[PDB]
Design a protein around this ligand. Structure first.
Ligand SMILES: CC(=O)N[C@@H]1[C@@H](O[C@@H]2O[C@H](CO)[C@H](O)[C@H](O)[C@H]2O)[C@@H](O)[C@@H](CO)O[C@@H]1O
Ligand code: CA
Ligand code: CA
Ligand code: CA
Ligand code: MN
Length: 1106
């Protein structure tokens, strides 16, 4: 390539001025808001050397009529009139250039459109709007090839672990063309660096063309190439289908430059110096400060009306984790906080889940959790909804060009995407407001699922920023799914933090530059997942690795969760208490994985600092990719080693909320993924002190042991993958107030004792034991007389109706009971041997081997009593008991909560009388049925359907059957046809068909096809040697009827006491009558709904006999 040339500059008709601070001088054109040149400590950076007196308004080239006025020694102002009648532009804008110490600020302070535009109202011509304002062509800062050390360094979005998003370019003549959007961008010489910020929400496309708030351009001027950094275009007045967006969607354009000398004392001026300084001019995502102390992220799940994780239970999880980490901070994402749970009732953000305890319990959760540094988030959706939802309306739904619905997710119900732009223009904000109003303060984060994939239309930079603003404005912190989403505002990205998702192309932001800048502000990065290669092969800064134990994707592994925290997350978060100061790459390595062989340049040393001048140095132990040392690091704090390879002894001087700890509370964590002794040098403030070590368990600090200090050092030879904590004085564990708010103490058996129960019988027969998932359970076995455990139920309301259940898994034929005595009345419920495996995937006690009760299975099901308090609640008792038996009964989780069911002879309390279920006041699940094994252990596709006329009912979008038969609730099964298996069943503990007694079972039902579903009668444990069922196949309810059909069956209780009834998915094929896809799922061909179940004991007379 030949030495390049361009026009020289004739500034003969230009009148320049200057504005300046004490350190930075800027020469500016009086004709146009352009900076010719910057000067600092006698060094120079050019700006836009070649005048370019145009802008672009709605992509029309405009020569503005400009008037100048210097305001003070640092500030100038420009009024800029904009006229183009051919394109209906008639407006003006005021711009200010202002120097502030070493920063240059560019602000459009004011915009007037002389065309009539009312935000919120119709406009007849969208071209009358002032939509876009572009100052491309006027570089805010640049560097010339004639200057020593001239380079440009910029970041683009990359989520592929193999591909860096960063460009590093020498500015030379000649050099390759450059016209490209960037997220972050820096120019420098050997003397000065500059960085540029803009609030432009410009996009040039997806992927690495998105989040392109800056634009870098090479321009050739005389005999030099210049690389300048411009703000990309800004957005202003916008509409959707003629409706102008709200005023809050308009943000005044703004950009800033910062110019610096060597800022990390490495005696070199480069992009890093600019990145350090850039932190003083950049946007900071709201709530970023909290991130560094949220060490324990996870999800607590509810789904399909089951209430797997009530709000108050979640607080017990928080307390376990508080103990096991010794006060590390926590972030719990409540997936299914609303409606019937996860993927129910979307868009009605304020509809907090009633069956998990509603808003009252949620508030109590948030409040009590503060002291444990536990922040709560919720999973919401702004892209799709279901007919059940209050906000399902035809006007909001997304249609395809041909008029068809753009169908969304299908699982419990078939959803339909919404038009996000339409939603924004029609009151979206108010939904967030309703939630804030209802819930009050203290919620940390909103996690908006799905947004960023285009289901709802445009989900790009502009729309994401508007959305994020709606949420931030209520006081909430923003979180997103995708690695590539909400770059301006997100603090957390699910697909970055859960390393397992998506594979090497869909992880966090693979940009040295971007992580240097914002590592401490968010979890959006590439963590350690060797199989993805490149940046994911042991990043020196770690990167959040998220695991779960409260039901998300069937995850239940508590211990794994805790060992993961210490293995990845403690050091990850440690670094987030500092800002990166220096970043050193080593030599390119070759790697092979995921089908390619490729070059990767790894980071070898990263330094960080804090406001107290503490210095952290992280060093990779080798640059040889095939050496074990490539995946090892040393970390030093002010010169002292705190990690080396597989082990670390890290100080931690922050309580759970991140507050500086008092001196007597400073501590150190030890963790080592290997066996073997490690030896460590203590800091001077520990070296002459006694030192005690504790092993951290779910019981807190254990196994106190004073350590021997020899020559300022300690030596630790302890269990691998086991956390320990070190103090300079003897520590104790506090009272946790287990299950506070839940009317009983320690409902989940996490307190390590039973002393708070009053035990009748041989107490040696009752023990706390661990499931195969290390879930602590009450076990009663080997007992020759009745054994009982009793507590008062405390803090109840007088004259109030209640439900209480206990999870029970009975391996004995012995009666196992739950009994409530209110002081004026006694009620009891029992089970003999359990006969139904648990198949609720988000429930902690499902039958998956790794969280099985015993013998690789779980029959846990909730066993209920229904009672009503009197005038006096001082002496209400709850009793768990077991009659004599050799085998074991396991009990876990006692939940007492308000319920207005009227199931027994039209009365609430457990008693005699006809059993009715209208599904209008279910406590949780699908009682008296429990989900069967038709889909195995799963987010079961049977739930309680909620009514919304007309959208859930016959006729709407051609729907064939009603979601809801009477009242507001029915029992619905979605598309579970042709499975030859049991969908759900009763169980003796929920309803017992007494030996030899005869019952009439009646219900109303809807069914989309003939003989897809059948009412069945069985006994004992069902097996698909398959079990005998009395089978009654059921016809469709709509071809020859306008409403649900009524069915009636006689059932006689087997002598074994273990008769049950249910619904079975036949092997017959369904009939979608020519419909397919979304239409077919929506309209209900493959559906079954039950309502108004009744079971009456009867004596066979007259015609009942025939
Ligand atoms: C990974 C993730 O967040 N995926 C979202 C989907 O999640 C699934 O939800 C179903 C129940 O509806 C089930 O629990 C699966 O285990 C879970 O992965 C889902 O919420 C959809 C809705 O559009 O969005 C994401 O893909
Ligand atoms: Ca430097
Ligand atoms: Ca438990
Ligand atoms: Ca009903
Ligand atoms: Mn539903």
């Amino acid at each position: 390539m030949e030495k390049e040339t361009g026009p020289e500059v004739d500034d003969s008709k230009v009148t320049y001025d200057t504005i300046q601070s004490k350190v930075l001088k800027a020469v500016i054109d009086q004709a146009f808001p352009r900076v010719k040149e910057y000067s600092l400590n006698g060094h120079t950076l050019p700006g836009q050397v070649q005048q370019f007196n145009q802008v672009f308004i709605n992509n029309h080239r405009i020569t503005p009529e400009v008037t100048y006025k210097k305001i003070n020694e640092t500030t100038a102002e420009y009024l800029m009139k904009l006229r183009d009648d051919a394109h209906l532009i008639n407006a003006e804008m005021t711009v200010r250039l202002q120097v502030v110490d070493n920063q240059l600020h560019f602000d459009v302070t004011k915009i007037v459109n002389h065309n009539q535009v009312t935000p919120g109202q119709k406009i007849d011509d969208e071209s009358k709007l002032l939509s876009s304002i572009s100052f491309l062509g006027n570089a805010l800062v640049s560097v010339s090839s004639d200057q020593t050390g001239a380079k440009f360094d910029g970041a683009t979005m990359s989520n592929n672990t193999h591909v860096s998003g960063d460009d590093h370019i020498d500015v030379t003549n000649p050099m390759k063309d450059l016209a490209k959007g960037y997220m972050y961008g820096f120019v420098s010489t050997d003397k000065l660096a500059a960085g540029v910020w803009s609030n432009s929400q410009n996009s040039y496309g997806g992927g690495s063309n998105d989040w392109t708030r800056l634009t870098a351009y090479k321009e050739t001027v005389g005999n030099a190439n210049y690389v300048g950094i411009h703000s990309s275009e800004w957005q202003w007045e916008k509409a959707y289908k003629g409706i102008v967006f709200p005023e809050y969607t308009k943000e005044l354009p703004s950009a800033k430059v910062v110019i610096t000398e060597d800022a990390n004392a490495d005696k070199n001026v480069d992009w890093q110096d600019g990145a350090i300084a850039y932190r003083s001019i950049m946007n900071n995502p709201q709530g970023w400060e909290k991130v560094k102390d949220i060490t324990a992220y996870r999800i607590a799940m509810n789904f399909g009306s089951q209430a797997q994780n009530p709000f108050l239970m979640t607080l017990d999880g928080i307390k376990k984790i508080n103990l096991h980490t010794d006060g590390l901070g926590q972030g719990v994402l409540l997936k299914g906080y609303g409606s019937e749970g996860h993927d129910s009732g979307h868009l009605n953000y304020a509809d907090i889940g009633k069956r998990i305890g509603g808003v009252e319990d949620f508030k109590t959760l948030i409040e009590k959790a503060k002291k444990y540094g536990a922040h709560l988030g919720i999973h919401v959706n702004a892209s799709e909804t279901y007919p059940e939802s209050k906000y399902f309306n035809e006007k909001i739904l997304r249609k395809n060009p041909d008029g068809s619905y753009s169908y969304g997710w299908n699982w419990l119900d078939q959803g339909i995407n919404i038009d996000a732009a339409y939603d924004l223009a029609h009151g979206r904000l108010a939904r967030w407001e309703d939630l804030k109003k209802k819930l009050g303060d203290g919620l940390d984060f909103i996690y908006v699922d799905v947004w960023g994939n285009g289901q709802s239309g445009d989900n790009g930079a502009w729309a994401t920023h508007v959305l994020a603003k709606e949420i931030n404005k209520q006081g909430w912190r923003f979180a997103i799914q995708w690695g590539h989403g909400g770059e301006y505002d997100s603090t957390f990205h699910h697909w970055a933090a859960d390393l397992t998702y998506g594979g090497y192309t869909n992880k966090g932001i693979n940009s040295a530059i971007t992580r240097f800048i914002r590592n401490h502000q968010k979890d959006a990065w590439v963590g350690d997942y060797r199989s993805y290669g490149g940046a994911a092969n042991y990043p020196l800064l770690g990167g959040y690795s998220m695991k779960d134990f409260e039901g998300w994707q069937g995850r239940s592994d508590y211990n794994g969760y805790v060992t993961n925290l210490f293995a990845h997350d403690v050091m990850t978060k440690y670094f987030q208490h500092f800002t990166v100061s220096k970043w050193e790459n080593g030599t390119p390595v070759t790697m092979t994985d995921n089908g390619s062989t490729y070059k990767w340049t790894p980071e070898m040393r990263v330094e960080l600092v804090d406001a107290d001048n503490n210095k952290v140095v992280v060093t990779r132990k080798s640059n040889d990719v095939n050496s074990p040392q490539y995946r090892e690091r040393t970390v030093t704090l002010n010169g002292r080693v705190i990690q080396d390879g597989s082990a670390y002894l890290t100080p931690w001087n922050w309580d759970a909320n991140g507050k500086k700890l008092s001196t007597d509370k400073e501590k150190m964590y030890y963790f080592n993924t290997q066996a073997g002794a490690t030896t460590w040098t203590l800091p001077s403030d520990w070296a002459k002190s006694k030192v005690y070590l504790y092993k951290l368990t779910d019981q807190g600090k254990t196994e106190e042991q004073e350590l021997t200090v020899k020559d300022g050092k300690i030596t630790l030879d302890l269990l691998a993958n086991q956390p320990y904590v070190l103090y300079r004085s003897k520590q104790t564990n506090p009272e946790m107030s287990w299950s506070e708010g839940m009317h009983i103490y320690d409902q989940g058996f996490n307190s390590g004792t039973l002393k708070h129960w009053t035990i009748s019988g041989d107490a040696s027969k009752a023990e706390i034991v661990k499931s195969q998932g290390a879930n602590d359970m009450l076990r009663i076995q080997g007992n020759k007389e009745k054994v009982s455990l009793t507590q008062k139920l405390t803090g109840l309301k007088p004259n109030t109706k209640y439900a209480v259940y206990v999870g029970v898994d009975n391996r004995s034929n012995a009666k196992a009971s739950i009994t409530v005595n209110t002081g004026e009345k006694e009620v009891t419920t029992y089970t003999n041997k359990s006969l139904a495996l648990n198949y609720v995937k988000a429930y902690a006690h499902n039958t998956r081997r790794n969280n099985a009760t015993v013998d690789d299975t779980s029959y846990f099901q909730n066993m209920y009593a229904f009672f009503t308090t009197g005038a006096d609640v001082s002496n209400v008792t709850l009793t768990l008991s077991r009659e004599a038996g050799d085998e074991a009964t396991y009990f876990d989780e006692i939940r007492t909560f308000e319920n207005n069911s009227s199931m027994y002879g039209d009365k609430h309390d457990t008693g005699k009388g006809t059993f009715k279920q209208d599904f209008e006041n279910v406590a949780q699940g699908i009682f008296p049925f429990v989900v069967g094994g038709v889909e195995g252990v799963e987010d079961n596709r049977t739930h309680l359907s909620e009514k919304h006329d007309p959208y859930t009912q016959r006729g709407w979008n051609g729907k064939k059957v009603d979601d809801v038969i009477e009242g507001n609730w029915s029992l619905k099964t979605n598309g579970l046809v042709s499975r030859r298996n049991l969908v759900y069943q009763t169980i003796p503990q929920n309803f017992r068909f007494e030996a030899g007694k005869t019952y009439r079972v009646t219900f109303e039902y809807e069914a989309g096809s003939d003989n897809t579903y059948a009412f069945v009668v069985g006994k004992g444990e069902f097996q698909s040697q398959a079990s005998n069922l009395e089978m009654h196949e059921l016809p469709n309810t709509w071809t020859d009827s306008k409403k649900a059909k009524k069915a009636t069956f006689l059932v006689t209780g087997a002598e074994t006491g273990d008769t049950w009834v249910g619904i079975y998915s036949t092997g017959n094929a369904s009939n979608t009558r020519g419909d397919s896809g979304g239409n077919a799922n929506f309209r209900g061909y493959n559906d079954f709904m039950m309502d108004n179940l009744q079971i009456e004991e009867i004596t066979l007379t007259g015609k009942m006999l025939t």
